[PDB]
Amino acid sequence: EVRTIKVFTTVDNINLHTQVVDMSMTYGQQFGPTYLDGADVTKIKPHNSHEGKTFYVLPNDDTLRVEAFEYYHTTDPSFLGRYMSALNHTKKWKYPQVNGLTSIKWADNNCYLATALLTLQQIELKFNPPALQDAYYRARAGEAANFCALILAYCNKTVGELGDVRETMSYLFQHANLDSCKRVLNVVCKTCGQQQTTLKGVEAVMYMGTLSYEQFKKGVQIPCTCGKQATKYLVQQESPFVMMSAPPAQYELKHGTFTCASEYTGNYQCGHYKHITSKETLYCIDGALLTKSSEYKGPITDVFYKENSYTTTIK
Ligand X SMILES: CCNC(=S)N/N=C/c1ccc(O)c(O)c1
One DSSP character per residue, 86-120 reads HHHHHTTS---EETTEE-----TTTHHHHHHHHHH
Q: Which does 145 bind (CB under 5 to 8 A by kind): Zn ion, Cl ion, ligand X, none?
A: none
Tell me whether residue 255 is one of the annotated catalytic residues.
Answer: no
CB atoms within 10 A of CB 64: 19
Binding letters toward ligand X, positions 62-101, x by CB under 6 A: ---x--xx--x-xxxx-xx---------------------
CA atoms of 86 and 143, how far apart (whole Å): 15
* Closest approach of Cl ion to the CB of residue 178, in Å: 12
Pairing label, strands 220-223, 229-238: antiparallel
CA angle 189, 190, 196 (to 5 degrees): 35
Tell me whether residue 272 is one of the annotated catalytic residues.
Answer: yes
Q: Which of 134, 164, 286, 302 is catalytic?
A: 286
* Closest approach of ligand X to the CB of residue 101, in Å: 30
Q: How many residues belong to the site for ligand X (CB under 6 A)? A: 12
Tell me whether residue 155 is one of the annotated catalytic residues.
Answer: no
Q: Which does 3 bind (CB under 5 to 8 A by kind): Cl ion, ligand X, Zn ion, none?
A: none
Q: Which does 126 bind (CB under 5 to 8 A by kind): ligand X, Cl ion, Zn ion, none?
A: Cl ion
One DSSP character per residue, 184-213 reads EEEEEETTTEEEEEEEETHHHHEEES-S-H
Q: What are the angstrom distances between the C-alpha of 121 and each of 97, 148, 281, 293?
A: 12, 14, 18, 21
Residue 77 vs 193, nearer CB to Zn ion: 193
One DSSP character per residue, 240-295 reads SEEEEEEEEEEEEEETTS-SEEEEEEE-SSSEEEEEEEESSSEEEEETTEEEEESE
The annotation places the binding site for Zn(2+) at 189, 192, 224, 226
- In the list 4, 24, 99, 133, the residue contacting Cl ion (rule: CB under 5 A) is 133
- In the list 126, 190, 218, 297, the residue contacting Cl ion (rule: CB under 5 A) is 126
Q: Which of 111, 148, 260, 284 is catalytic?
A: 111
What is the binding site for Cl ion (CB under 5 A)? 126-127, 133, 136
Catalytic annotation, residues: 111, 272, 286
What is the binding site for ligand X (CB under 6 A)? 58-59, 65, 68-69, 72, 74-77, 79-80
